[PDB]
Symmetry: D2
Subunit: 277 residues, 4 copies
């Protein structure tokens, strides 16, 4: 029952992102939150003396920071996503980058504990906020996702709007010809929560195109790219159905794309259902 604590440009920027995430967590323990969480990030990011361009889910246009505070990196984030979360990728022209230029990204999930999944390009680490210390404690290094899972995760209430491939794929999960058990279904309906289950327990998560939202719903710059980056770094795949999420070339900051991600073999089975349609 005794412990020692040890510490573990870009670096200051992530400190401030983590600090904002600390702030956000406590406000949640208690729509007025969107505004509040948004301003926490921006300000804490602005005053980390290390950003030039910011993209928020909450702001129509990108937020260019004052030259005195200006820095090198660009940050696209969703300040606030039942367990909700925060999403960010560190990279206006300078904000429309393809996901494969990400230097750092992560998310936070605000449950009983505040967890942060984080990667700077050499894997994924999981942190648990220690609110007494006001510091993030490493709980798992280099998290790897299962090659294949036994869970599938989408809003099946959109069945009537599904494209052929999604319909075929869900059919296979429920009626495996093979004579393997059907997958279990889980869908919390908060993307950080569903993605995070997928990372940790394995399987696949889907918010694809459908009749209602033919480009999908989830946002490229600060939802899909970020979790795509985390998932790939964890040994998984993230696709739109036609190309890896991280390879999309953004043509607007608030652009939407389809998101399919998870265990690589599960995503690869989904892609087989696409080629064949």
């Amino acid at each position: 029952d005794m412990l020692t604590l040890t510490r573990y440009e870009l670096t200051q920027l992530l400190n401030s992102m983590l600090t904002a995430i600390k702030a956000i967590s406590s406000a949640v323990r208690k729509k007025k939150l969107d505004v509040l969480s948004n301003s926490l990030v921006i300000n804490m990011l602005q005053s980390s003396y290390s950003t030039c361009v910011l993209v928020s889910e909450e702001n129509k246009d990108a937020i260019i920071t004052a030259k005195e505070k200006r820095g090198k990196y660009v940050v696209c984030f969703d300040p606030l996503d039942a367990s909700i979360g925060t999403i960010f990728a560190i990279y206006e022209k300078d904000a429309l980058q393809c996901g494969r230029n990400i230097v750092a990204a992560g998310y936070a999930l605000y449950g009983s504990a505040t967890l942060v999944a984080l990667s700077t390009g050499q894997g994924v680490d999981l942190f648990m906020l220690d609110p007494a210390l006001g510091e993030f404690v490493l709980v798992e290094k280099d998290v790897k996702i299962k090659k294949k899972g036994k869970i599938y995760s989408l809003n099946e209430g959109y069945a009537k709007y599904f494209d052929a491939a999604t319909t075929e794929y869900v059919q296979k999960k429920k009626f495996p010809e093979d004579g393997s058990a059907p997958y279990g279904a889980r869908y919390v309906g908060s993307m950080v929560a569903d993605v995070h289950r997928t990372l940790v327990y394995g399987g696949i998560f889907l918010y694809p195109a459908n009749q209602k939202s033919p480009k999908g719903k989830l946002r490229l710059l600060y939802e899909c790219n970020p979790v795509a980056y985390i998932i790939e770094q964890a040994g998984g795949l993230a696709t739109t159905g036609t190309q890896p999420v991280l390879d999309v070339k953004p043509e607007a900051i608030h652009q939407r794309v389809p998101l399919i991600l998870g265990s690589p073999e599960d995503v690869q089975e989904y892609l087989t259902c696409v080629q064949k349609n």
Copy 2:
């Protein structure tokens, strides 16, 4: 930014249940938990000088308490159910009672905040644990569930095992002939979490009979009856598909039953799909 706090046999028993729930919450903030949470309840219930018979999800046989500590009430509970929870109904012969003899019941959900839904027969109150005070704060009196919702909630991965009625019902939710929007689907896969969403946001939750578990999975005495009691007290319905959960006559302490509950009109539409099969 200034507040005053005010207070708000059976009564001591619920105090101790709440205290055990306090204890359990903190252990969770951190399988070894099942054993630990179980023993917390039992002991705190035993030493409330007010129980005679206990039924735990964790113990094969009922736990008869020593005469010096013995009391009037009987407690059936699930110490530990991603947001997990604790479930209990206050009522061995004396433990096999039909749900309609419940004097008190509730659950706890351990998320960012520990919430307790509680009823003693005159409605449902929602409490939020204040871990600084070690006390439960009332956040909503007499919670009522929507007459009808727009959410349905089950493991659709069991489709291949569904009975005709469940299959028909899910079909209607996704393809409303009517020309109303399809319901949204949510399934966390933890029963306290799914039930609680259902209470608060409305709709229906299902873990019915299927080929695999023809009696269902969920346990009558300390899962289904308790949440059935909470849901009815909130203006909803809870059925097995053939009779209200609370009217089942238990023929074993660890008996399983099907559970369908939620907004009353949603449960009543499900029941229509049964009569017709």
Copy 3:
């Protein structure tokens, strides 16, 4: 084990002071603090849209706030005072007011619990910070100090520098001619902590003139006046040895005065030792 919470220009200003005190408490749970605590107050006070002039223990000159945010009240404070604290009185010409013009004042003591003693002119209330809620909970209304105590409190290590009256008075406390027990001595050496013991348990507290500091040490505007106001509102006295602290006319913002306060009969015995010298 169940509770209900109830709420309990000038008003927004105190909210923000309390919020800054919330912020300060958490930073303490962990010299770099002086700067940090100071800036928290100023900013949170500035952006309460209700101040015009501020005086900090940390700033040589008074801090005039921008007209867009400007308001009616003036605040003199010590952001940071072993249990330390925060001190403030709500009232540059406009900052040099005699203590009897105070509209509101209080202190915070950062121990196991963060306590705030607060008065707006109709007594003293004691609050305990609930860090989960981020709100202050009333624990005692209209605190009254004992008419007479059994504790005296000063740095007796300054004996060699004491004036005649202080020496005579300490002699009486230790060798009561009367044949009453000697007072007990307590001296934490943090003024908020010593004052607060004095308020609650009774007795007297002294930091008088001496050879070293002939004007005393403690600061008029944001140490002595504030606690003088709290103590008088609690039925006590606060004197410099020649006039009530609150009646001094400040001739500089960082002016020092002698402070003697406590139970009124104890302060009145001290004053008798002065007249007679």
Copy 4:
């Protein structure tokens, strides 16, 4: 803002003592406490399967534990000592040992943070309770006390009852013939708090014999011996005025002794004032 945590018979016993201290801390954050804290220690010590004999400040007679749980060590403790604390020394015949047979001892101080000073014979470590983790974090290894300080600490309100040596010594602190500054005086009046200041900042602390309590007040087995052990391990001295505290041979479990401890040169100056009287 990122950290890794690392771990750091006798050993299980100290775990349980620390656990009881965890429990006690939280009850304090909120006379009924004496009983509660006492029972926490005893039970957590009893069920560490490692004690045979216990001595509490709260129990007239020693508490012999049941053979099934019995173990090797004997524990003398004060469950509860404004910042209060817990004191314990690990060693009925088997309970009357001279302090120099101590295998382990420490104290806890319950302030803004719960600190534990701990020694197993190879120095003193300081720990800070992390209440989120429920674990104690090392903040300083092998704490050493100053050779000489500038603080003296006793209830000078007992002056009329002082023996010649104490009176002479206090005179020297206030009127240093030498032409060095007088010591500062601090006296919180809680022994854990006063001792702890003394360890960390340096100087001397005294609760000697006087006319009222000619054997002193503080208790040998679970107040004086424990802090004497901590202080010596930190490079200081602890004396009764005639022999080191740890060398006293107890003739009763609730025996009292005089306590003088601190920086070794300060204690040695006090002892010079004794030989000379």
